[PDB]
């Protein structure tokens, strides 16, 4: 009484509605600190003349 288990399991079955269907989420956290920058976007490297 007044004591419960906090963790609960997500019911997953293919017959469940699309709204409750499990969705795998990937969250990218972009943080710019005082340290030098490394990761950058792609390159171009066009033709040479």
């Amino acid at each position: 009484f007044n004591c419960y288990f906090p963790l609960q399991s997500y019911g997953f079955q293919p017959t469940n509605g699309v709204g409750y269907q499990p969705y795998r989420v990937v969250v990218l956290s972009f943080e710019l600190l005082h340290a030098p920058a490394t990761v950058c976007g792609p390159k171009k490297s066009t033709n040479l003349v």
Partner: protein, 597 residues
């Protein structure tokens, strides 16, 4: 610290644990109905008992949170159902013996049969056997043999089993602090906690009795017209001021008079609206039948159906290898899983039934966002009422001509609509008297006002006064008429059918005022009108989380039931029947009997 925080915590963890077990319990019943196998029959019992025992385990912890310290209305409503112990309040013997009576009475109903008097070898069961023969049977003796002989081995044998059902169920209501078992069913309409919207349980007896008084002038004319057409067959047994035989109602229990529409057709020289021959030429199947109905809900603003809904539907019965019940039903399991199990043929009724079966699913989508305990209709009459308003819109010639079923040159006039109102009146006006008659009798027997010996004496005595029906063969207190009925033997609410007629008509009159349609009510069509859908969607998502009296005000603007929409929609028919009954006597007398001369 306060009990409110503890109550809300118990309610949050209850919806999750109950949603998983409830979904598996309903899913087990689906595989059992769609396919009959030894694995599905056991899964339904295991999954059914696991969920049945779940509420019994949660009910013990629900009674530890009194509702006096809870100031939230939505919180007390969730705990209001959990506070009930169900059969736990009954004694160990009375609790276990109750299920034996329900299973014994339900078994005799399905296994009950009446052997053919002329063919003792052939013995046909009631359903379908006895229900189909009595529909088209025009014989006086043929209908009396199956009608009289059924209650002999059923009504008489079920009397001792029904007596225990009355004493056992009463012990449950008394333990719940209810006046009697009859008040138990009236609790569905109970409304408390909101100032001015409170609805007492005892007020239902006065509302159903007060609204029935206004239906008498409409039913009396409808009864006199039906007795005039059938008066030529048996003038001796059928009196002009008397009552019609009980076995001639068109079926076993005389619930619906639609079967008599054939001989009651006012005009036989004019065609009738039927989509059977039109759909055949169009070459439509069960796949496109539901698709055409899905576009109807979108025209009013209601969301469409999910992909899984149409993919998991069952459109027919693949032979006897895998068999399913063709009885149309809308199954709502959970987690956004909606399905419908029905056998789909090509007929004008299946098209109308498609909108009804889909209405239940469409209705479950609005309140699906509510908690598990808060997912439900405001009462027992709103379940099938929301689905009837959808079918009534499809039966209108305007909706049929829109999709192309009915020819655009079809002439629509009084002669055409008068025949349509009569068909709907028998299914509507016919069930009302029978519903108020049987439902009121159960309330009197359970309340203790009718001694055990007067059960049958008061049954037919109140039948001629309400529905105006007399028994060809007099019966003693041994027979039990309700014992044979499906809802009475299965312990289901029989009052929900009476209120469904008043609720479906109120929405029909209110929804048509939003769409700005002019003319008679039966000419109204809600298709292509997005204004009426937005007004009905508000109450659709509320469910039972709010008092039905309050939710009903946001639609029709009424705080209770009213018969006014019943007179207007049937007004054109009442004006015509009043003239045809001038040569006859409107009404019936209770002093006439077929065996008393």
């Amino acid at each position: 610290s306060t009990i409110e925080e503890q109550a809300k915590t118990f309610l949050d963890k209850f919806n999750h644990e109950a949603e998983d077990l409830f979904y598996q319990s309903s899913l087990a019943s689906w595989n059992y109905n769609t396919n009959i196998t030894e694995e599905n029959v056991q899964n339904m019992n295991n999954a059914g008992d696991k969920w049945s025992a779940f509420l019994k385990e949660q009910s013990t912890l629900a009674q530890m949170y009194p509702l006096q310290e809870i100031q939230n209305l939505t919180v007390k409503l969730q705990l209001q159902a959990l506070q009930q112990n169900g059969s736990s309040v009954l004694s160990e013997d009375k609790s276990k013996r109750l299920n034996t009576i329900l299973n014994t009475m339900s078994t005799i109903y399905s296994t009950g049969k009446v052997c053919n008097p002329d063919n003792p070898q052939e013995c046909l069961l009631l359903e379908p056997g006895l229900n189909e023969i009595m529909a088209n049977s025009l014989d006086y003796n043929e209908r009396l043999w199956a009608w009289e002989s059924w209650r002999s081995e059923v009504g008489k044998q079920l009397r001792p089993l029904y007596e225990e059902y009355v004493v056992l169920k009463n012990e449950m209501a008394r333990a719940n602090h209810y006046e009697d078992y009859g008040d138990y069913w009236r609790g569905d309409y109970e409304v408390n906690g909101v100032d001015g919207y409170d609805y007492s349980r005892g007020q239902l007896i006065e509302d159903v009795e007060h609204t029935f008084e206004e239906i008498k002038p409409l039913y009396e004319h409808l009864h006199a017209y039906v007795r005039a057409k059938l008066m030529n067959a048996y003038p001796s047994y059928i009196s002009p001021i008397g009552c019609l035989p009980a076995h001639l109602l068109g079926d076993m229990w005389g619930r619906f008079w639609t079967n008599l529409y054939s001989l009651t057709v006012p005009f036989g020289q004019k065609p009738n609206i039927d989509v059977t021959d039109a759909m055949v030429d169009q070459a439509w199947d069960a796949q496109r039948i539901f698709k055409e109905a899905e576009k109807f809900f979108v025209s009013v603003g209601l969301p469409n159906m999910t992909q899984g809904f149409w993919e998991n539907s069952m459109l027919t019965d693949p032979g006897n290898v895998q068999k399913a019940v063709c009885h149309p039903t809308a199954w709502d399991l959970g987690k956004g899983d909606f399905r419908i199990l029905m056998c789909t043929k090509v007929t004008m009724d299946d098209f109308l039934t498609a909108h009804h079966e889909m209405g239940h699913i469409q209705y479950d989508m609005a309140y699906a966002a509510q908690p598990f305990l808060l997912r439900n209709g405001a009462n027992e009459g709103f379940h099938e009422a929301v689905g009837e308003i959808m079918s009534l819109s499809a039966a209108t010639p305007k909706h049929l001509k829109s999709i192309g079923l009915l020819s655009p040159d079809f002439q629509e006039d009084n002669e055409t609509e008068i025949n349509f109102l009569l068909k709907q009146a028998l299914t509507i006006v016919g069930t009302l008297p029978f519903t108020y008659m049987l439902e009121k009798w159960r309330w009197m027997v359970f309340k203790g006002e009718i001694p055990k010996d007067q059960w049958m004496k008061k049954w037919w005595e109140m039948k001629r006064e309400i529905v105006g029906v007399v028994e060809p063969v007099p019966h003693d207190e041994t027979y039990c008429d309700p014992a044979s009925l499906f809802h009475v033997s299965n312990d289901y609410s029989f009052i929900r059918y009476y209120t469904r007629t008043l609720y479906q008509f109120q929405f029909q009159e209110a929804l048509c005022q939003a769409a700005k349609h002019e003319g008679p009510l039966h000419k109204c069509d809600i298709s292509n009108s997005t204004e009426a859908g937005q007004k009905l969607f508000n109450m659709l998502r509320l469910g039972k989380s709010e008092p039905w009296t309050l939710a009903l005000e946001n639609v029709v603007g009424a705080k209770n039931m009213n018969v006014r929409p019943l007179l207007n929609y049937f007004e054109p028919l009442f004006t015509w029947l009043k003239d045809q009954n001038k040569n006859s006597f409107v009404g019936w007398s209770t002093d006439w009997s077929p065996y008393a001369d």
